[PDB]
Design a binder for this molecule. Structure first.
Ligand code: THP
Ligand code: CA
Length: 135
């Protein structure tokens, strides 16, 4: 796997962002995580939804460098969103959210699970500390 630069266009929510990738505006969906929904009516504004978005937003807006890291499988989901591990100044946003109890490790679709254990460990740590989602 390798990191590729991307430029923030707009953070949509905690796990979905619009990035300029290879001079192309693209919506990216954070691999292996699920931040609470703030959009979809069928889900409603979920607890920590807002917090997860602010977090991603903040992390990404304050970053000097944004990098996208595709996994070994599909790079896009059925919605056409790029599936990556996104890094803000070398910090994986996916993990950052999980570690904070702002996302749960979800949608682990092999073989796009390269950092699953990593994220799982951070999630365990967040549950362990009863952070946000786990509080
Ligand atoms: C993270 C991720 C989401 N998705 C799909 C699973 C869900 O489809 P459905 O929308 O049909 O439930 C949806 C979850 O994304 P969101 O959390 O943005 O809703 O996106 C993938 O297909 N692959 C992935 O790796
Ligand atoms: Ca989500």
């Amino acid at each position: 796997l390798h990191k590729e630069p991307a430029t923030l266009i707009k953070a949509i929510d905690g796990d979905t962002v619009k990035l300029m990738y290879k001079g192309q505006p693209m919506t990216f969906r954070l691999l292996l995580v699920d931040t609470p929904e703030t959009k979809h009516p069928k889900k409603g504004v979920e607890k920590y939804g807002p917090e997860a978005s602010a977090f991603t937003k903040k992390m990404k807006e304050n970053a000097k460098k944004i990098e996208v890291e595709f996994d070994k499988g599909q790079r896009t989901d059925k919605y056409g969103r790029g599936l990556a591990y996104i890094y803000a100044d070398g910090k994986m946003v996916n993990e950052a959210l999980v570690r904070q109890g702002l996302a749960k490790v979800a949608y682990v679709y092999k073989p796009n699970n390269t950092h699953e254990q990593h994220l799982r460990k951070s999630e365990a740590q967040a549950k362990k500390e009863k952070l946000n989602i786990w509080s």
